[model samples]
Target: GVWTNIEDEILKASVSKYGLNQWARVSSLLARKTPKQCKARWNEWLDPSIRKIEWSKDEDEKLLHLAKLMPTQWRTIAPIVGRTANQCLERYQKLLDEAEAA
Candidate 1:
């Protein structure tokens, strides 16, 4: 499946800070989980499609806005992102250094 802009941004941020080799290893592990295990754990929160949304003009702008807003806490952004609190926290924490640096 094609990656979404969010996925690309997350990967870029992760690799820049963590290094490509480490990122590859981490990505491999993340992908190694069984579909059932992943679904059971994250289906409710995780976006179903790897490329669910096109990064059209609107979406690109929205993403930039979100990054700047950095809602910073899962409690604030989870609902907006249609993710569980934990999923929101994990995604932000695991990807954006600016989120952690704040």
Candidate 2:
């Protein structure tokens, strides 16, 4: 049986987001990795790619594009972004704040 304490919408969104790309690789690793270790791996993945995108061309414009594609699925975003569902929500809000400030 699946273990679930999260809201259905959050779980659904996460599953959808995770299915879209390289999240499977992250998930497979998570099965054996500690949560902290998984988070570290996710940070490593997010850091460089975000920098690469930020450094090239219109940084704010690129961020706007990214914001559009920001994953809404809690499960998918959490594993890939390296945070839990609630954390992802806060992170998303933070990003929105930065984007608006930019």
Candidate 3:
């Protein structure tokens, strides 16, 4: 199920105090979601802090270069490319698939 605005509000407020790492404490404020669920939601979709944007050519080039040096090191590469680790990994996988297909 999707989170309500009220639930998101509570999460945002709690996250401010507890920090993003404290999912167990944060999830206690919500009725339905568990700590893991809350963490996944924040990391993958709900993080208001991360810049969600289209992948530019420069970013893709950097990602590809870094991937060759540190394959599967999305966490290390994400900050350099200004994206989330999951986003980096997803983009890399898509690029890899495209390259294989071509």
Candidate 4:
């Protein structure tokens, strides 16, 4: 399901209450999203800790090694790469398309 601004706002406040634990409790605040989805949104987007920046060749190389080591393991590799899992996956996809294919 598509998440909208209203849902995001509600989730943001809801997350503030629980922080890292009890994602199940947070999911109840938003009827649309599930527990894992709630965590996914929090870790990838709403968390103030995630700072989006342009990926350097350095970042590209990092994910390449992780990709080779784990093969599409985005969540496990993201923290090591200093990016969200979404970023890890997309960067890997982008780099792979360039035919470095790492």
TM-score of each: 0.28, 0.30, 0.73, 0.70
Please report how far candidate 2 places residue 44 from its true position, in Å: 20
Candidate 2 Cα misplacement greater than 4 A, ranges? 1-72
| Local accuracy of candidate 4 as per-residue lDDT tens digits, 67-89 | 88997456899778878888788
Order of models, best lDDT first: 3, 4, 1, 2
lDDT of candidate 1 over 8-87, digit per residue (tens)? 44544544556533534435444344334433332332334223343354533444466568756546654455445555
The alpha-carbon deviation from the true structure for residue 13 of candidate 4, after best TM-score superposition, in angstroms, is: 0.7
What shift in Å separates residue 30 of candidate 3 from its native position after superposition?
1.7
The segments of candidate 4 whose C-alpha lies over 4 angstroms from its true place after superposition are: 65-77, 100-102
Best of the candidates, TM-score: 3
How far off is residue 16 in model 4, in Å?
1.0
Ranking by TM-score: 3, 4, 2, 1
For candidate 2, the TM-score is 0.30
Ranking 1 against 4 by TM-score, winner: 4
The total number of steric clashes, by the backbone 3 Å criterion, in model 1 comes to 0
Residue-pair clashes per candidate: 0, 5, 0, 0
Off by over 4 Å in 1: 1-36, 40-51, 74-78, 81-102
Lowest lDDT block of 10, candidate 2: 48-57
Q: Write the per-residue lDDT of candidate 2 for residues 1-102, one digit (tens) a residue.
A: 232333223333543566434444445533344434434444433333333222223533443354467655445554444334454465557677977999
Which residue pairs come into collision in candidate 1? none
